[PDB]
Amino acid sequence: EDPKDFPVDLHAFLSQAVFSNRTVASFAVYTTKEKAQILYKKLMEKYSVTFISRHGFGGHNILFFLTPHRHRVSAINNYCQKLCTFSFLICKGVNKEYLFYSALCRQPYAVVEESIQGGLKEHDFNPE
């Protein structure tokens, strides 16, 4: 059985309003390692990301990315789903950027690749 949602330990950081027509600038994707490998570079280029990271979790991968322009979650999901038939893929907006990335850099998650050397810094966002 493929996952039907992100792991529960990330729920608090994610927006559940997948049909929201508000535009946002931070997204997450949960899919296979094969599809995430491909999407890491495709999304980097498509959305001119300011940051993207790919993380492993129990054989699958999670992508996290930030964009210089805002987008609807539905648009990003549509683009990602184009790659899959087939493979599962969950796409949600991220409400708590630094907390989400931080969780993805601690067990049980691991960073596999990221687009800025040294990753995101706490000081790159305002405090909570």
Numbering used by the authors: 134 to 261
Task: Quote the study's own text.
The subject of this study, the JC virus (JCV), is a member of this family and the causative agent of a brain disease termed Progressive Multifocal Leukoencephalopathy (PML), a disease that is often fatal and for which there is no cure. Herein we present the high-resolution crystal structure of the origin binding domain (OBD) from the JCV initiator protein large T-antigen. The T-antigens encoded by polyomaviruses are multi-domain, multifunctional proteins that form hexamers and double hexamers at origins of replication. The topology of the JCV OBD is a five-stranded antiparallel β-sheet sandwiched between two helices on either side.
The JCV OBD (residues 132–261) crystallized in three different forms that were termed form 1, form 2 and form 3. Form 1 has two molecules in the asymmetric unit cell, and together the three crystals provide four independent structures of the JCV OBD. JCV OBD region B3 (residues 216–220) is poorly ordered in crystal forms 1 and 2, but well ordered in form 3. Crystal form I crystallized with two OBDs in the asymmetric unit. The molecules are orientated in a head-to-tail manner and situated at approximately right angles to each other (94.5°). This dimer contains a small interface (∼550 Å2) that is buried between the adjacent JCV OBDs. Therefore, we examined the higher order structure that the JCV T-ag OBD adopts in crystal form 1. Interestingly, the JCV OBD forms a right-handed tetrameric spiral. The angle between the monomers is ∼900 and the rise per monomer is ∼9 Å.
